[PDB]
């Protein structure tokens, strides 16, 4: 099958910027390539047809170019509504295949997270499980690392996390991490900590509590 590889995988830009996304096909696909825009939770919206033809109603700032194996989508002057993920696609031969997407995010100034730790509730402990939660609030860029320590012991395999979509007003991200333990394990240890690293922190930030 034909692999469609987009570069970059993500891009930060400001309104007014010229943005270029490229797509390399693993085999020649002629001009049989299309481009799409997709926003979180929504179906893709078509932009370019046959490498360079703008679909009816698509704004003139979107243009496509290329043939063979190298294709390019250009936004001449980015608008507020253009922050989204962009995909290329070949329809030259079967199976039709899509690129992996390039996320165009809003550039802002770097912002270190505000870090908060929450112990398990007394209500939950009755159930025989303990969830400890770490919040990293309103940071930028998206890259952050959370490590859990229980009585100074680095934890592995017993946490999960998720990250919000970029905030449409302030351009930040937030991340929530949950460490899950049995009540019996929870009760066996005193100090619960999450250690956070991020470009905006010159050294790691640790928030902790002592059980009880």
């Amino acid at each position: 099958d034909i692999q469609m590889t987009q570069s970059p995988s993500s891009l930060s830009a400001s309104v007014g910027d010229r943005v270029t996304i490229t797509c390399k096909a693993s085999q020649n696909v002629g001009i049989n390539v299309a481009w799409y825009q997709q926003k979180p939770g929504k179906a893709p919206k078509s932009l370019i047809s046959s490498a360079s033809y703008r679909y009816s109603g698509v704004p003139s700032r979107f243009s496509g170019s290329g043939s063979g194996t190298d294709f390019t989508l250009t936004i001449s002057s980015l608008q507020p509504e253009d922050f989204a993920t962009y995909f290329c696609q070949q329809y030259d031969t079967y199976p039709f295949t899509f690129g992996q997407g390039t996320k165009v995010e809003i550039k802002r100034t770097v912002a270190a997270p505000s870090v908060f730790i929450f112990p398990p509730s007394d209500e939950q402990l009755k159930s025989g499980t303990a969830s400890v939660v770490c919040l990293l609030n309103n940071f930028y860029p998206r890259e952050a690392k959370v490590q859990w320590k229980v009585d100074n012991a680095l934890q592995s395999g017993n946490s999960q996390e998720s990250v919000t979509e970029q905030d449409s007003k302030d351009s930040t991200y937030s991340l929530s991490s949950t460490l899950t333990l049995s009540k019996a394990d929870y009760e066996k240890h005193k100090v619960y900590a999450c250690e956070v690293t991020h470009q905006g922190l010159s050294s790691p930030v640790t928030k902790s509590f002592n059980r009880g």
């Binding site: 078509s46 899509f98 509730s121 939950q124 939660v133 609030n137 999960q160 919000t164 937030s174």
Partner: protein
């Protein structure tokens, strides 16, 4: 005016089958190829196959061939994709799309969850504020199936500073999510903060007051 309107969300067990529909309007149905494409949040967009309505022949991605059937009814202007031997990795949003030198028109999508889990409402636990000027508090919404749950604060009166996070799927097969809000510390103490959780599949409606200690 061209519209592609798909059937609603589905929850199926491993090994079973799902049939998603796509009702086309605003054009002569028998004149364009209708394709199916899916998107799972870690295999990107994947093309599944096509059908030319009025003509029984369909074409499939080899990745799906042997367990996928695409059909169309010209009388009802409706196309269908049936996927069988369902596996957890088939958890995805399924789209129909009309073809012309690309896919100019897409259906709204149909979410399909493949899991052996049973419908279950969540437990809701406080994330209590700790002991300079801002405080964070929240609710943990644990152990529910299927998605989604909705969370509001003070019955919709509190919207600023709220983050409700994407759910995570636990090894139990049940989802967990948190919702947090940041507020002035001074408020801990004149204002009441209540998280309102709604899980429709279980008609679970819970209001949890979140307070210090």
């Amino acid at each position: 005016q061209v519209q592609l309107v798909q059937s609603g969300a589905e929850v199926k067990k491993p090994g079973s089958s799902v049939k998603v529909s796509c009702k086309a309007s605003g054009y002569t149905f028998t004149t364009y190829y209708l394709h199916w494409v899916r998107q799972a949040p870690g295999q990107g967009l994947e093309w599944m196959g096509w059908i030319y309505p009025g003509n029984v022949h369909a074409q499939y991605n080899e990745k799906f061939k042997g367990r996928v059937t695409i059909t169309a009814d010209k009388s009802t202007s409706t196309a269908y994709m049936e996927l069988s031997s369902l596996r957890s990795e088939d958890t995805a949003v399924y789209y129909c799309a009309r073809s012309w030198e690309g896919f100019p028109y897409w259906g709204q999508g149909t979410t399909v969850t493949v899991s052996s889990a049973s419908t279950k409402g969540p437990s809701v636990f406080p994330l209590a504020p700790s002991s300079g000027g801002t405080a964070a508090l929240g609710c943990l919404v644990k152990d529910y199936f299927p998605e989604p749950v909705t969370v509001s604060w003070n019955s919709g009166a509190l919207t600023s500073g709220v983050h409700t996070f994407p759910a995570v799927l636990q090894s139990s097969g049940l989802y967990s999510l948190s919702s947090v809000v940041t507020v002035p510390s001074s408020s801990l103490g004149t204002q009441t903060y209540i998280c309102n959780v709604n899980h429709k599949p279980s008609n679970t409606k819970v209001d949890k007051k979140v307070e210090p200690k």
